[PDB]
């Protein structure tokens, strides 16, 4: 049960990490792209990518 729970918690943390801003203005890729122009939206895109 520990092994099963460890794997489930690992994948749960991995999926939950997609809700983090990571220093960007938004955690949503579409919201980042649709609120800023492409030339300087790349900074937020790179923050999310890192």
């Amino acid at each position: 049960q520990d092994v099963v729970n460890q794997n489930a918690q690992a994948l749960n943390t991995l999926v939950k990490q997609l809700s983090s801003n990571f220093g960007a203005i938004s955690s949503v890729l579409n919201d980042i792209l649709s609120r800023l122009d492409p030339p300087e939206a790349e900074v937020q895109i790179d923050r999310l990518i890192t």
Partner: protein, 49 residues
Amino acid sequence: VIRGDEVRQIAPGQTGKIADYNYKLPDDFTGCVIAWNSNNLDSKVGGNY
């Protein structure tokens, strides 16, 4: 030749009328943008339209 208020605006990645309608620059532009005043040599007293 452009209006005197867009020399800072023609830069790559900068939005504005003259850039996005006449001379849009690529985001990966590598080069030197050079400009100098030409009021005396271009302006006409009757209006250099």
